[PDB]
From Swiss-Prot, chains A, B:
Family: Belongs to the ABC transporter superfamily. Methionine importer (TC 3.A.1.24) family.
Protein name (Swiss-Prot/TrEMBL): Methionine import ATP-binding protein MetN 2
Its job: Part of the ABC transporter complex MetNIQ involved in methionine import. Responsible for energy coupling to the transport system.
Portion of the full-length sequence here: 256 to 345 of 345
Organism: Enterococcus faecalis (strain ATCC 700802 / V583)
Self-association state and partner proteins as the record states: The complex is composed of two ATP-binding proteins (MetN), two transmembrane proteins (MetI) and a solute-binding protein (MetQ).
Location in the cell: Cell membrane
């Protein structure tokens, strides 16, 4: 992997993996969540490609902010059809 | 797997996988979160064994309740040293 290297380098907040299969909400996802949930975003690693289905791939991001807001932003992503999970829970 | 079969049979709330490596908080975890976060718990699948390290294994549970409370219960588990993630995000 090794996802714990991301946790090691980016300790604060939560690190999440976002998946894009082309079904995600057609809006500016990252700015949308920044503004709505008052979270900061740092891109750690990613691979996204444009396909006929739309943007497809993965993004690992660090979210910073109040705990409740980070949690809400993560469920927000999921509801916007971006599968999201906090790394380090396997 | 197939974790989506759990989502199919238990549609409401969130389905989470909890991991126990023996480092988890030494308290009655499931009742603790039920009471603190006002969530309901249904066990879907699990394999837990007692070892010299303590209780080790996994539990898949359905959490029911208000969205914010479910989210808080999930982070609560993590803080209590039970690695937890919402299934269906791979
Ligand atoms: Zn997707
Ligand atoms: Zn929104
Ligand atoms: Zn996982
Ligand atoms: Zn553990
Ligand atoms: Zn507690």
């Amino acid at each position: 992997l090794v996802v714990e290297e991301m946790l090691e380098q980016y300790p604060n907040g939560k690190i999440v993996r976002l998946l894009f299969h082309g079904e995600q909400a057609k809006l500016p996802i990252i700015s949308h969540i920044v503004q709505e949930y008052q979270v900061e975003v740092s891109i750690i690693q990613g691979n996204i490609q444009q396909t006929k289905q739309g943007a497809v791939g993965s993004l690992y991001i660090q979210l910073l902010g109040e705990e409740q807001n980070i949690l809400a932003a993560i469920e927000g992503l999921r509801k916007l059809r971006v599968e999201t999970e906090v790394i380090g829970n396997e």
